[PDB]
Amino acid sequence: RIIYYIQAVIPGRAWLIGSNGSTLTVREGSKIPGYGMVKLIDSLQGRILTSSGQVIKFSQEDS
Amino acid sequence: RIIYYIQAVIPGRAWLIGSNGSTLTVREGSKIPGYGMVKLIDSLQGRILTSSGQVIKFSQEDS
Amino acid sequence: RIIYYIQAVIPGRAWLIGSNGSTLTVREGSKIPGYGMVKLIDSLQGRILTSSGQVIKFSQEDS
Amino acid sequence: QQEIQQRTSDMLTAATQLVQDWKQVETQVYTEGT
Amino acid sequence: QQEIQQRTSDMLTAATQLVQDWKQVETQVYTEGT
Amino acid sequence: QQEIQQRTSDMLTAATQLVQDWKQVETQVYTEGT
Amino acid sequence: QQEIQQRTSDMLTAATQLVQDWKQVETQVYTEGT
Amino acid sequence: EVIDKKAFKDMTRNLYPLNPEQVVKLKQIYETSEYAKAATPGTPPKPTATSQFVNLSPGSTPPVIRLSQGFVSSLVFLDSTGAPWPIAAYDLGDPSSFNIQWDKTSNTLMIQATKLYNYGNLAVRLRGLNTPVMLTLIPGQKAVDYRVDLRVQGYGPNA
Amino acid sequence: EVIDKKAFKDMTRNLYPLNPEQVVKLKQIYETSEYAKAATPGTPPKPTATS
Amino acid sequence: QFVNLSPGSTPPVIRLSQGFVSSLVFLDSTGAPWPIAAYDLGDPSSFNIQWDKTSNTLMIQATKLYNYGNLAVRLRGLNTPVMLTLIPGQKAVDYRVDLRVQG
């Protein structure tokens, strides 16, 4: 599948980058392909909770 | 049918865009083709109530 | 017949436009062809009362 | 009784401002273009 | 009782500022480019 | 009782500075290079 | 008891200078050589 | 050694009287007050573009322009065929209610209303006409005219 | 700890003496006053062109 | 967006935000740029416009939170002015708007 990584996060929004180079921006209730619905955007600590249980974080080599 | 989306909303008016590219503006009591009579324009949260029961909101990809 | 629509209204007068493009102005006691006598000019809410029972209002597409 | 004259003096101040605003009429302005 | 008269004076100060701001209308600006 | 009135006056001074800082918006700057 | 209020006023003087020094950010300098 | 903990927490409350949770609540109070101040009573007018024919007979009524306070309305003058008709001069009554911007050669007038419910008239003289064109200007209606195309009965210098 | 809630609600009432509901009602009072000021007594005259 | 100069259509809407820059670029029906002759802005206390006097791009910044107005733009070859409305404080902000004019 496609893995998404956090590029920048403020309260409210989050800018994401995928393994294909595609760039997205998401809000509190939003759709991510392959992940589902955004459940919680937590601006501190760089964590995004998703309805499928997966957690989107910063990249390990870019943090 | 034709799906309408909220483009901008203030108290009183709302500007709409359709799937055909047509643009409209509506008031509290007004006619929408395929929807009926406007019942409530609620400027906060981007919701418009319609007499047929359908709810016109912002577009998912443009919000 | 001919349908008349309110174009502008202040206290006292009202400016009307017809389906034939003819433009009129009326006072409290005045004659309208096909309608009768003006009974009440209501500057608020855009309603004109006529002796035949018909009500002249703003146009639906221009209001 | 005492509150009547206090209300009367407040209305006289507001009525004097309303009357002199209705007195003012400005001159027309003619603009020539070339 | 006297807390009503104190609250009324604070609302009159705020309402005078709100009405004065609604009076102000700025003239349009025409910009010509060449 | 009197410690509430002392705490209220400290928050009113800090809230005035916060609101006044949020009012300020600086005009954009256009830079042309040649 | 009174030694707490004397210590608190000494800490407020030092904390004000520390916060004021952290606000200062100096603008970058571009040096062109030819 | 216990005194140093007591002095630190009392100094922090004096230095920052508002919590980070209370700063967030105050910012929501401030923007809600700005939303209610900028909201318009009733419904706002509908922005429209119109087109009228102007008859210079001594029986007809002068045309009506609908305006709004702080908004711009553009008036463009055309002849019977549809070509533009340039403006020679204009004369405005009650300049305290209306403001007009005009470059001295074109055929477009841009009028802004200054007051809410005060109305007046305007005199417009075209280049080839001898009869002046009379308009009335009423603000504060249920519709606002963004642009009015005016058809004048004669033939202009362009045809 | 309960003092901080009491001081916060009293500070808000001094900072904003008018509710968002009361700002909306005051704007309707203001524009109704200008409508009565600008209204003409009787009927306005009819605009005519003559020869 | 496509802009229609018919006397029945509605003027287009621009979504802005306080402190942010929105750029509007004017194109014709084929897609070529259309230079601007002049512009007229109502309520200059709510919006700020930067423009070099020859190009076809306007850069507008909103100054207030929820105050809205209109704007008139005259192009080089057109006689009909273009009317726009400017509403800030929405759920979307326009970084760039492409406008097709009918002529």
Numbering used by the authors:
A (entry chain WF), B (entry chain GF), C (entry chain HF): 207 to 269
D (entry chain XG), E (entry chain HG), F (entry chain GG), G (entry chain WG): 791 to 824
H (entry chain HH): 105 to 263
I (entry chain XH): 105 to 155
J (entry chain GH): 156 to 258
What does the paper say about this structure?
Legionella pneumophila is an opportunistic pathogen that causes the potentially fatal pneumonia known as Legionnaires’ disease. The pathology associated with infection depends on bacterial delivery of effector proteins into the host via the membrane spanning Dot/Icm type IV secretion system (T4SS). The Dot/Icm complex of L. pneumophila is one of the largest known T4SSs.
Three of these chains were unambiguously determined to be portions of a second copy of DotF (DotF2), DotG, and DotH, while one chain could not be identified and was left as a polyalanine chain model. Located in the interior of the PR is a portion of DotG (residues 791–824) consisting of a single helix that starts from the inner membrane side of the PR and is followed by a short loop that extends toward the outer membrane or ‘top’ of the complex. The interaction that is observed between DotG/DotH in the PR is similar in structure to those previously reported for VirB10/VirB9 and CagX/CagY and likely reflects an important function for retaining this organization within the PR. Located adjacent to DotH and on the periphery of the PR is a small globular domain that we identified as DotF (residues 207–269). This portion of DotF consists of the same residues as was discovered in the OMC (DotF1) and thus, likely represents unique copies of DotF which we call DotF2.
